[model samples]
Target: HTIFQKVSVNGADQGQLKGIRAPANNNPVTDVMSSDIICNAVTMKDSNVLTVPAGAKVGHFWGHEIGGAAGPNDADNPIAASHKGPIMVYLAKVDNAATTGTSGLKWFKVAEAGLSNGKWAVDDLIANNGWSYFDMPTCIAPGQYLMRAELIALHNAGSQAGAQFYIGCAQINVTGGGSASPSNTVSFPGAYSASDPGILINIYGGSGKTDNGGKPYQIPGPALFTC
Candidate 1:
């Protein structure tokens, strides 16, 4: 009960995220983290990235607002009040020689939304059907980059690989930013291991609610960068 933008093969819609082959056809699958995504990127018909300014507001489902909006499918899944997860934005500059391919991309964490006020409302609301005040790093170097937005559903994460990942990527040429660069960069298929605590933990409060009594769910990925 949410919507997000999908990149085109230069304008041809490649079906949301050009996801994995499953459920009988090569359509998008619910849970798949195969390093194989790289191969998918290579084969996309005619692709180019979308460019946004460094540190500018990106749209969300909520328009000019923050929270307090319920999901469109609240009656069916109650996902608005439930489905507590982490929303994250990551960035990776394209390697000079391999600018158009996924071979040499190294992504870094830029921003993330987890929980506040004992709720995942902010994270959930942003993905539901509105626009947001999302931005990029003002200190990133001017270059071609891959901007990725990912949300992880941890409701059934008690099991191995039970978590669900919803991912999107954009091709961008960051401009008018600072000369500062980031370290501790990682590769997509390699950045997240299946067994990380953040990827394999339970978010319930021993019941149908989350217990942020201590560290609840951690957004799994590299640490956020600081310019």
Candidate 2:
């Protein structure tokens, strides 16, 4: 169980419990067809919509519970180390991100970090003290957007619908962006399938080791959007 608690814009911390649309619980969404796949069952609405400059570095901070780690030294701040998998970021432009419903919105992938150099993305997230960073596209039209930050845990992913999807949507207004339209868009519930290679896999070896058994990990969903 993990929760998206806070965010950092261009390396500066934006206070605690500010802009993210926090979910009702830290439980992961396993069903791909459910609307929870869009924003992890968010029941509470956040009042603030952070204003971010285009091409700025945005850091997403997660924890086992809301409000994030007790302090920098809190060992169990982000999530369990054994919940190994990837981290992905997506954005959907909307007229009013804070009030718009998630259905029928066109989403585009911006960043994804999967297994690399024998390490999973969650490993890096834990090492960074629950912080994962990604950049806002510089060429998208300036407007309000719902930024979806997701973490997929594949520990029990050998079976279909067993992967844990930890998701959260942060409301943001992009400034200083261009007019380059993003064409490769997808909807959340329609984007991911339970049988996708990355969604269903055996990270553990034949002998039940923790290692990935040298098989390449594929990131689910469409390719990253380019300017």
Candidate 3:
């Protein structure tokens, strides 16, 4: 049972004018305000997602071309964006057989978008006990985008573990699961829009492809996720 919530695409919807030559109504300081997200036919924004375990290490999954906000300081013509597909989340994690220790050899991701930046994707992973009441600072603007919180189970760089973890159940704002009414849809506002851009992550796991020497393991997806 998986649920969905809104994830925000960073951009400038409305703000003060920068200067006489300002275009697209770019904010003077270009700061993100009201990073809140709601859903409907409208789309999801600032959608909060969480990692697999309580405190796992999760990195920013921008698919293959993840670089972060790319914009101009000109203020008049600001172009902040990444090209093409982004790094999908490697929801895969190592489990008991991998020897990850009591921490549950199984390594999962606990990353929440539009919640907070710089903090551990897992440590900052929403644990119910807390919340993302204010995410306006990270959000950029008005448009459509997708905010995904996919699950993946993976082993270490050279380890080959038989165990793997995945999005058995995940979601945002709304409780994750099919038990909900109408069956909540896990979607972002723009689907994959650049203007209303958010984060994109593809799932990866324990068993993947191997090189000729059978030395390093490589998942085939980025293979859909990476380059």
Candidate 4:
């Protein structure tokens, strides 16, 4: 199996966080042939007992040749996503506050190292908007999926009664004919699932169920995902 292999954007290569915050703006990049891909998931300090594993999904869909005529209210999907490779999913925001628009693992200050290592995430957590989180580089015969989001609150609830952001997602789960039947599953989040169990809560406005205890951290980048 090829674990995680993908890099097709056309902006060069090698972890390009070019200028001012995350700015993964170039689209994709998961080519770390041997090291450098930290943060694995399951890291909590306090956020009203956070927990995930209820089939923590959000593998971020979008298959079917990445839209040829646009369906699911097509907008080219989450900015032409295609979660190439690189995965993680750990989030618990309590009275947090962040702003950048978009949701679905779309918040992460990028990297700072160790816990508070960064902040915010939900933009498809790992991405793949090109029909279902981009996985058509080799051209197969399997497609049709979608993962549209609409949540925002990367720690900054500003209400004294809202916050819980815990994202340790460093994904990597290939699918659809490639790498010899790639596989992953710990019951969710894809690629044998990590991201500390998985999450996407608001609690104060809607959706609540905090009591996290899903430890499995040991990755933070080079998730090289494709499912």
Clashes of each: 11, 0, 51, 78
lDDT of 4 by residue, 79-134 (tens): 32211112332221212212211122222221111112221122333233421122
Candidate 2 is scored at a TM of 0.95
What does the lDDT come to for candidate 2?
Answer: 0.87
| RMSD (Å) of each candidate, 1 decimal | 7.0, 1.6, 20.0, 19.3
Provide the clash count, candidate 3. 51
lDDT of 1 by residue, 56-168 (tens): 55532211211223334444222333556776777777643224555557778887877766766445554554332356678888877766666566776778877766454
Candidate 1 vs candidate 4: the TM-score winner is: 1
Write the residue-wise lDDT of candidate 2 on 1-227 in tens digits: 79887789999998666777778788899999899999888877766889899999999999887763355565556888889999999999888877888898999999999998789999999989899998888998898999999999889889988999999988889999999768789987999888898998889977776568868889999999977
lDDT tens digits, residues 112-220, model 3? 2221222222222222211111121111222111222331222121222211111111121212112212111222221222122122122232453211122222221
- Model 3 residue 222 distance off true place after TM-score fit, in angstroms: 12
Error of 3 at 9 (Å): 13
Candidate models: Cα lDDT each? 0.54, 0.87, 0.20, 0.22
- Candidate 1 lowest-lDDT run of ten: 20-29
Candidate number achieving the greatest TM-score relative to the actual structure: 2
Q: By TM-score, highest first, what's the ranking?
A: 2, 1, 4, 3
